[PDB]
Structures are given as C-alpha cells and as structure tokens.
Amino acid sequence: SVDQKAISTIRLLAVDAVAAANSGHPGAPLGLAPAAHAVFKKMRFNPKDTKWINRDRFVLSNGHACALLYSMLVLYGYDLTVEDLKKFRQLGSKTPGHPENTDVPGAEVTTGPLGQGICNGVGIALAQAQFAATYNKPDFPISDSYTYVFLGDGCLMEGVSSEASSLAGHLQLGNLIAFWDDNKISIDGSTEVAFTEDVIARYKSYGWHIVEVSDADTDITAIAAAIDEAKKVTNKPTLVRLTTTIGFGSLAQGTHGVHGAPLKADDIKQLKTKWGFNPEESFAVPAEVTASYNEHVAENQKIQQQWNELFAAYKQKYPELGAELQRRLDGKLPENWDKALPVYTPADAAVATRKLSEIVLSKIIPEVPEIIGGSADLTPSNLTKAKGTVDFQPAATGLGDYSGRYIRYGVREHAMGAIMNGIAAFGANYKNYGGTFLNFVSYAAGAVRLSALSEFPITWVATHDSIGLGEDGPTHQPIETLAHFRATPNISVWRPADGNETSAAYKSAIESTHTPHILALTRQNLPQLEGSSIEKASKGGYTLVQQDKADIIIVATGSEVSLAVDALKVLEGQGIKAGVVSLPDQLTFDKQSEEYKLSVLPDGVPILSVEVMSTFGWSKYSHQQFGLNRFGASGKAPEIFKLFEFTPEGVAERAAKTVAFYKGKDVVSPLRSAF
Amino acid sequence: SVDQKAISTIRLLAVDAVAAANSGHPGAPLGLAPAAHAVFKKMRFNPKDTKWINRDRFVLSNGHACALLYSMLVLYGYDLTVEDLKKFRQLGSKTPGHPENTDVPGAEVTTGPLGQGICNGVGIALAQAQFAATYNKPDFPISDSYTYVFLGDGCLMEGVSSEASSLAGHLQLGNLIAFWDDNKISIDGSTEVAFTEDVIARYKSYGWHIVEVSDADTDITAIAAAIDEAKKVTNKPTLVRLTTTIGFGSLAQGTHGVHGAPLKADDIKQLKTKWGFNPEESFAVPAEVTASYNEHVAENQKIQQQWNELFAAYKQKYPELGAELQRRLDGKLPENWDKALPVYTPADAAVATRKLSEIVLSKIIPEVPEIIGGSADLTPSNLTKAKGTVDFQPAATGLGDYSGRYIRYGVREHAMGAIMNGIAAFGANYKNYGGTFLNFVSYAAGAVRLSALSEFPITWVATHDSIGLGEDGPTHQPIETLAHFRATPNISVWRPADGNETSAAYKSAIESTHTPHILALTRQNLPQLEGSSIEKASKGGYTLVQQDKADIIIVATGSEVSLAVDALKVLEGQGIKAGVVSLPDQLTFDKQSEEYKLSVLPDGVPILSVEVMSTFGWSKYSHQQFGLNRFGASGKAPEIFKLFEFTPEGVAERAAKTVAFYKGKDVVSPLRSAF
Numbered sequence A, B: 001s002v003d004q005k006a007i008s009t010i011r012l013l014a015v016d017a018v019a020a021a022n023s024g025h026p027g028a029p030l031g032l033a034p035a036a037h038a039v040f041k042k043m044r045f046n047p048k049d050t051k052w053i054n055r056d057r058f059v060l061s062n063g064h065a066c067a068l069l070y071s072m073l074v075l076y077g078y079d080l081t082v083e084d085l086k087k088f089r090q091l092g093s094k095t096p097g098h099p100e101n102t103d104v105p106g107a108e109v110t111t112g113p114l115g116q117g118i119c120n121g122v123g124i125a126l127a128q129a130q131f132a133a134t135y136n137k138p139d140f141p142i143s144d145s146y147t148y149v150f151l152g153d154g155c156l157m158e159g160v161s162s163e164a165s166s167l168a169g170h171l172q173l174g175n176l177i178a179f180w181d182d183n184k185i186s187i188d189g190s191t192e193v194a195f196t197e198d199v200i201a202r203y204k205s206y207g208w209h210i211v212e213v214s215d216a217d218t219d220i221t222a223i224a225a226a227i228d229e230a231k232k233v234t235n236k237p238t239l240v241r242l243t244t245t246i247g248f249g250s251l252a253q254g255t256h257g258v259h260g261a262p263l264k265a266d267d268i269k270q271l272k273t274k275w276g277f278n279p280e281e282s283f284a285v286p287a288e289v290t291a292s293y294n295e296h297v298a299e300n301q302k303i304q305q306q307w308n309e310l311f312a313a314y315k316q317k318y319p320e321l322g323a324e325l326q327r328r329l330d331g332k333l334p335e336n337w338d339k340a341l342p343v344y345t346p347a348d349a350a351v352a353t354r355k356l357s358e359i360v361l362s363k364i365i366p367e368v369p370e371i372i373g374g375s376a377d378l379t380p381s382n383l384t385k386a387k388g389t390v391d392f393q394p395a396a397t398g399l400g401d402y403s404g405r406y407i408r409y410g411v412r413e414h415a416m417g418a419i420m421n422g423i424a425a426f427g428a429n430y431k432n433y434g435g436t437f438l439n440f441v442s443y444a445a446g447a448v449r450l451s452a453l454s455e456f457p458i459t460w461v462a463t464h465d466s467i468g469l470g471e472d473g474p475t476h477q478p479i480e481t482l483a484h485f486r487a488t489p490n491i492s493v494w495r496p497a498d499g500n501e502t503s504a505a506y507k508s509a510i511e512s513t514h515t516p517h518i519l520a521l522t523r524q525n526l527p528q529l530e531g532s533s534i535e536k537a538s539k540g541g542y543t544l545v546q547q548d549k550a551d552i553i554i555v556a557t558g559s560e561v562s563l564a565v566d567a568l569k570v571l572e573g574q575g576i577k578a579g580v581v582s583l584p585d586q587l588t589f590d591k592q593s594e595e596y597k598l599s600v601l602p603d604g605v606p607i608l609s610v611e612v613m614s615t616f617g618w619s620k621y622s623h624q625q626f627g628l629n630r631f632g633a634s635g636k637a638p639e640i641f642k643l644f645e646f647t648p649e650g651v652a653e654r655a656a657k658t659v660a661f662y663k664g665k666d667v668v669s670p671l672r673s674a675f
Ligand SMILES: [Ca+2]
Pocket: A152, A153, A154, A181, A183, A184, A185, A186
C-alpha cells in the first residue's frame, strides 16, 4: 500500500541521513516510523504556515531520533529538503544532530536533553487550554488543537518527566496525547538493567488514560484507533504504549548497537531490498508517497482557510476580543501597557524587591492578558495570583478554571522551567513566569539553558537572592547562581536595587521576544534610591551617582547598591570621592553602545565591584571585586552581612585599598581589551 | 505513659526552639514527633560514637522539620544540648535552620533542599548492601544495619525522588524504610491544588512494599509494627504512610500557616497545658524521658561493644579482610595504591581523556576495594565496569550481585548525584564516582552543590566536555558548566590535558576526604605533552613550557594545552617567545603557596588564557581571555574549532594582539590584588 511505502520511505531517509553523516541514531527512527506516519496523518498543520495558531503540535522528546522528524518535515514539504537531509549533522546545516526551534522549520521546541520535550508538550497543552478558555465562544472554536508527543525510555527515567506527568494528570489535560516507544533498550543495554518499574501503573497513578498497541511495528490501524480513543477522553492526558522493535528491519534490530550508531552498509542494502527499494540508491522519495502526503496537506490548508474565515466572523461578533487576539498573533503588546508600571521616588518607603515584584504583577496582569505564570516550591505569602484572577485548574476540581492565570506547579522547579518553555512555544505572545527561590532555579538548569538556546521569553521570579534571606542558611543562600546563569549565553539576569529598577526589569522581561529573564529579588527591605529611574535602569547599567573628580567608582547590583551609596559617605570622611554605578542587568548593559558603556565605566579611574555572591564575571566591569566566594550561614541577615564585612565601613576599607593599589598606575576601563 | 511524655517533650522542644528564633517550621515537627519517637526507639546508634559503622542511619529529608532532629539528638545525649536548641537559627550556632553534616553531630547528610534526603537514604542503603556483601561471613554479620528516612509531600513532588525511588525498587533495597508524612499540606496550601496523584499506587509500581498507619498522630504501636513488617520484607524497600495532622495540638493544626512560621504565644501555652507541662516554662526535659532514652542508649552501647568483639574475632578468622576493613574504618587508602596509576611519555600515542580515564579506573579498581561507581545517561562504550568486576544488582535478577562494583543508574543524573552523596555518607572510606556527559552534570546541580557543602569526596566522570564532541551539537556542548562549578565553593574541577594529567586528577579525586571532584574529559584524541607529569599536575597548575624571556604566557586547560603548544610554534615564526602553563585544576592551584603560584604566573609578563568555554573566572589567572561565550554548533569537531578560530593561528593572533596591547605598560601578575 502507499502507507507501507511511506513508512519504508521514512525509515530509509532516516537511515540514509545517518549514513551520510556517519553519525547519529538510526534505531528509534526505524522503530517509530509507523507511529510517525499514523500521527502526522491525523495532525492538522500547514507546512507553508508553521505559525498557524490552531495547528496540532508535535514534539519529538526522544530528540536523538531527529532523523525521523526531519524525514517527516521533508516529506510534507516544510522548508527543508532532501539536500538538507544529506547535510545531517554537518556544520551550518538546517539538520543539526538534535532539533533546534530557532533553526528548523516545524521544530516546536529544542529537544535532545532527555525529559525536556514531554514537559514542553505539557506546557503547549496547558497554553492551549488557557487560550481556548480565554477566546472560544459558542460557534467559535478558535482553539481546539492537540499536542502529540513521542518519548522514549530515557525520558521516562528522568525526574523532570515524572514532575510534568504528575502535574498534567492533575490538570486533566485531555488534549495531550503522548506515545511511549516501548522498545526495551536504552544506551546501557536492556531496560532490565535499571528500569523495571511498571510504567503503565505509574501513569495510571497520575490520572492518565492508557492505550496499549501491542504491535506498533506494523499496526498503524491500531495506532490511529488509539488516537481516536484518546480524543474521546477529554479529562485525562493519554499515554499510548507503542511496543516496537528498536531498529526494526535491521540485521541488528532489537539491540543497543542500533540505538546510537550508523548501520553497516550491507545492512542498509538488505533493508532496501526487503522493502522494494533500490539498494544502490540513497534518499529515495517515491512520487506516490509525495502525492499521498500532499493530499493531506491540501486538506489541512482548507481547514486553515476555514479557520481564517471563522476568525474574521469572530472579530465581527466579538470586536474587542477579536482585536486582542489579532494583536497577540501579530506579536504586539497592548499600546502603552508600560504606563501601568509603578514608579517610585526617594521619598517612598523601603520595600523588598520580592514585594515590589508582587506589586508590578498586580498592576500589569490586568492590563496584559497574555501574561500567565505560577510558582513552585514557594509559600503563597512569597508569591500568589494577582488580585482579580483565579488559578488555572480544570473546573471539575472547583479550585480554578482553564481561563485562570496562576499555575500551581507544586514542588516541581525543573518541570516548571520546561513547561514555561512549552507555554512560550505555543505562541500567541504568551509572556509567562515561574516563581521559586533563586537557589532552586538551579534544580531547573536543564530547562533554563534550553530557554536560552531556544530564544524563549520566559521569566523566573527568583526571590530570596542571597545571604539576605537569613535564617534558612547556606543550603538556601545563592553564591554561584548568578555567575552560572550570566555565563550562559542569552540570559538576562536582573538584580534590581529598588522600585524603579524592578519596574525596568519587568519592562525588559515582558517586552522580550528572544531572551529569557531571571529576576533576582530580595527577602529584605531596600531603600528607594536617589537617581534611579525606569529610563536609566532600562539601559542595564547606569551612573547612579556621578562624581567628576572620582578617586574610585563602585559598581554594584541589587541590595549592594544602597550599601555602596552608604560607603560613599564613609569614604567622603576619609577624603575619598566615589561615584556609584548600578548594574541591574549585565546582558542588557553589554548590548548598549560602546560609547554608552564607556560613559558608565570610563578610563582613568579604579573600579570596585560589590555584590554578595561569586566574583566570577565581575572583572568585565571592574578592576577589583568584593564578593562572597564561600558558603553562607544560618542567622539573622544583618548579622551575616556584618560577619562578611558587607557594611559601609567594610566596603569603604576595600575602596580605600583599591585607590592605594592604583596610585601611580595608569588605569583603563575594564571594558577595554586586546581583541 | 513515659512514651506519651517523651512525645510531648519532643513536640515542645521543637516549638520552643522555633519560638526562640522567631523563625522556622513547627508544623511537621508536631506531626512527626510520635513517629520520630517510635523510630529512634527501634534504631541502633551510639550518641558517643557517631561513626559506628553498623549503626542504623536516620535521614530527615523534609529538612525544614529539623527542630525535630535536633530535639531527638539532644534528648539522646548527642554532643548537642538544650543550650544549643535555644540558639536555633542563630549565627554560629550548632543548630542551623537546615541540618548540616559538617556542623551537627548525628546529621548524616545535609538536607533542606527538597528531594535530596530520600536519595541520600537510597545511597546509604546501597552502600550498606555493597559493604555487607563484601565483608559479611557465616557467623560474622559485620554489617546488618537499616536506613530510616522521613519525607514530606514536597519531597514526593521533586523529580529527583522519583528517580531514586524507581532505582531503589529495582535494586530490591530491603534495608531501606521510608516514612511519608501524609499531612495533605504543602507551602501553597492543600495538596489538592497540585498533588492529587495516587502516591501509594506509584510506589507499588516501583516495586516498593507499603504499610499504612491511619492514625500516626497517636498510634506508636502501629508505627513500631510497621517497622517490624518492613524488616520481614527483605527484597523491597518499604514506604510507611503516616497519616498525620500537621501542627498536631496547635490551635492552627491542619493548616498551611503552621508549616513554616512560629506559633502564637497563647497557642504554645495551651499546648503545654493540655500535655501536662508548665505554660510558663520553655525547653523542659522531664527526667523520666531522659531516663527512658538513656536505657535505650545503654542497650545500644552494649550492642556496639558486642560488635567490637565480633570484629576482633573476624580479624582472627579472616586476617586479610579484617585488615582491609580496619584500614577503611581508619580512613586510609592502601599503602602505595597510587603506584597503580598509569604514567605516559611524549613518545606514547594520542588518546582521548575519556579513554585515559577508563584505563585509570581499570588499573585502580582492582587495587582499591572502596572504589565503586557507575553511570547515568551514557553509553556503555563511554563508560562501563572495570574488567574483573560485576554490576551491583540483587542476585535475584541474575544481572549482578550486591558484591558488585558498578552501578547502572539509568537515565537519572540528579538522583545519581544525590545517591553518590549517600554512598559517601555511609563512610568506610567509600570513594565513589558517577559518569555522564559534562553538559548533563547540570541536571544534578542540586546534589552537586550539596556535595560541596557536605564536604563529600564524590567524583563526576564528565565526558564530552566541549565542542570537541562535535555532531550532537549545541544542546550537548558545555559553555557555562565549568564556570558554574568553579564558582561553587569547594569543588575541584579537573580538566586534564593528557595521560599524566588524567592520572593526577584521579590521584586527587581518590585521595580526597572533604572535596568533591568533577573530571572534564574529552571525546577527541589529545597528544601526550612534553613536560607533563603526575608530580607537576598534582599542584593544580604548573609551568609546562618555561621561557625565560617570555613576551607572553599562555595558560590553558584540557584540549587547549596542546593548542597553546602549537600556537607557541606559530608565535616563534612571528618573533614572539611564549611560555605555556597548564591549569588542570583551579581549586588545587589556588590552595598552593603564594610563592608557588607566583612562580607559575609571574609579574612582568602578559598572560592569555585559552579554554573553549566561558571566560568567567579566568581573570583570576590572566590579563586577557580567549574563550567561547556563545552556544556551539552541530558538525565535525575540527570544523567547529576552525569556525571559532581555536586554531594555532587564531591563538597566535590573539597572543600577538595581547603583546601589542601591553607594550609600554607595567604588568603585574593576575594573582595580585588590592585586598
Ligand atoms: Ca528505548
């Protein structure tokens, strides 16, 4: 049949791509080709409009199997060709060794690191439910799409997938349909060596529906029927167990050796012969397969055309909601939304930046409907929903509704990070956030790094940023955390000092389209600074206190800016004139013009950094660094600051030493370099 | 009864400690006091010998409940007093807000970050099984101890606990007994908001045994019986469901408000009144409770005395095993074990450092019985057991034995990290390791940080360290990873360049007693260097190529040392004389004398760093830094190096620019500072 020919075509494209690279993973593509064929036949998508908001989404969580994804995209006429397949895993190609959403048309997310894609799928499905609840009306099914995820044994061992699966079951996400490649093989060999749990029993315990397909090597009718069954279960995510043979058809089928290395040339020849292909030919695409796939694309394009007309009729009946939806699909925030950002003066009271952040959210959430977010491993007293909103929950629970805006992630930081990526990936201008303690953003490093690589505008609301949290002690107090994330490409790491800086941090986070944000916020109260503003803080770094005859400039962030200002007064008494620079986001500052940056950190003056965390990175901006490069302590916060000499007198002493160290030396800006 | 009085005493000590601090968590201590009393009565331990190797171990994984742990330790006469309790959460006290194994007698591990303690318990139990299989003989039960773990709802949501629980069930760890505080409350409020899974069904799916105690607020008889039942099930870890009231006895019992904030003073008064205590008195310890607890301590001390005699008789019957066990309990490695480390010369072939590491392990494992380890999310071709050993598995599986030395962790990096901490915590000189790709050590950051804080000599064997891995691409290629871990206090991060440096890295890792190690190893082949040795590399940084008239020194690590040596030859052709420094471990180097360090990085010469990763940290050792501060690429590794100009010519160009930049400038060592 043409279906059988299509499956062979998929298999052989994947095998041939791996062969050309002499690198990559042919086993899972061979095993999953029947399922991929069956699922893509059920999916609604337009290869010529990858951003259609009512498309079904597909996520290949076992991302090493991506020769499979690329083969599907090529066969369906996405902006990816057989010539691109021939360049699989080759420098600069459109077919990298793991799929990248920035580089690959039809790759919704960046997968490869195990466990991530299934969580991303949870987030896409969460967003779809929230979006549909927000926009759908009687006779106007604006959003009714499904989220299809392929996953492997490795994904099921990673804790992040357990977290997301528990939460997805709780959230009754009936438009999520996941497929487990039950092939009994991982990298180390048999799953009998380390993975003997009853996976199906576990998924039932989370509240998922199960369908089992006992012969997924051939039974595409049963795979299609499993999809139909899953669609009837509207209040549970579904796991479809696909019992497959890894490397199906290969001489080495059913072995670990086919998981992650190219097949032997003679093996590829017999594959081709047994499936009716020419063993002397590579990258064959039978025209009958193309025709069959083009028929499904044509049908999907007519569905999209009808959706466009539905949307036009929606705008006529619901003008305000229609305009809102149009604006979001255009990628634009509401006009002048930022007028809602709170502004402070030095006459206002001291406030913790965690509380300032709460206040910002309270003001902007009602004005910007595409903001949703939540928290994990965090008291409601440290972050909760904006007044006038409700939690995102299935209505059946009585605890919220899918129209809700605040997600109760539970104690699941890593999955929260990966789910945020999926919400961003959904599109429709979603600007989503996740709260936890800064120190436990580290639990989610796998996902955070992927936010950066994937260019997703997600936001971490990361409170209790330092020893300033006090009594919980060194297990909770960040030291290395900002250095870690600042060292990662494409992460804005805001550490605002006061009310105006906190508003600038949110302006950046919400306006972002390609850069994830981490907002490092305090437990303890900080003063409103003389010289701060949203305008100046928006530059990432700025001159807070200008001193034309400066003996030294102190550059600081967050809680240490006020400390620097107090140190300036001590230094004046010692006959030393200091300027102060506030550097709320190093990435934003780095992106400013060279002349702007040099106006902030000029030549001819020693510069001392102060931040109660690792000194790593700080030499970009300073000659000497006062930081904390040891673990913290359990006690009242002001006593810990005194212990480590983060006091006005301690800063002044180090500033005076810095001035002395550079007497008679020529000093140029830390921004200067040799290359 | 005295048992009831003891439980009230525990409860009130915990409440009073939280009250004195005006900080901390009284709810779980109130709920878990009956269970803590019952479990400690069943445990064998000596408060006067916290390191008795056959003690039962207790782990409080819900570490925020530590007022409870401290109360138990005080009541049993550990080196912790009521005066220490009065200083709970106070700077410099022996009673920090979360328990720290370095600071607190009877704290086996450092808990607080959720999910970790249960995994640590898995590791303690794994080590006990391996230890018993190694040493026990007929009539000589050298090791027969249990591992008791308390955990909460938050712990059960964290993915790391799922990973460890799946693995513990697979490993049939029948001496592990965990207790779930089933109190329906987390920080956000009811578990109904985010945690509605069937926990018991999930634990059955992992192969655990279950006991349910429906009234754990009062039924200590049933808690004791649950322990007895668990001990009869020798081939499954057991989860005991303790249905408790959070804050039991408080006016606010059964609410989120009692989870993490001090009780009201009037509430504490009525607690005391209803339990027969004086509401005007704090930190009361009834003498009858002390007597009862002292009786159990006396009995346990007689058990230890009998164990000491058993050990003496074991040494008579089994002299060689006895001497080995004695050596390990003394914390000493075999005499001259390091003579087994491989040594190379520049005449030897190029080898990848991953392969050099395999070879080291192959040579040292047979000589050092306290080395065990494994791998997670890694092909057996990248790391497997040492020849002549077997996997650690229950014999019932036919796949290994508990005497085995190689652990199949599955795709569970985070749990592997936390389990390694538990193996180290067991003691007996265990020197344990875990293999994965360097980029996915980040999945385990929560545990890695705790290795550092806890001072555990664990080792990560972290291969595929850079863009040198090639085709898997930017999702797999570390950029930020070494900066992250180098910025963390107390982590040795070895990046060996060649065979001799790899042997030095292992010498450091295995000799370690207080510092975790990460070994960053290459996929690609590297040459044996002229000038390397185990002796010199043991200093962390050393002069590889000395040049008395140097125009520049190039400092490099790992794969970039050979690159620097090739660049020296290009520079000679341009009339520039360079020295080379190899810096295989920054921490070890930092610990050397100031004079040694200055001999390596002298004044009066520009210094350029080269490492194909983040430049963060490198200004400690250099004036200019050539690194990679963007994500990688998917292609053949040598082509990626060429793209980013990590070539002899690219290094030489930057070196020449550095020389030019410092012409006419006075240059001092990067090791100099103002303070
Ligand atoms: Ca598999």
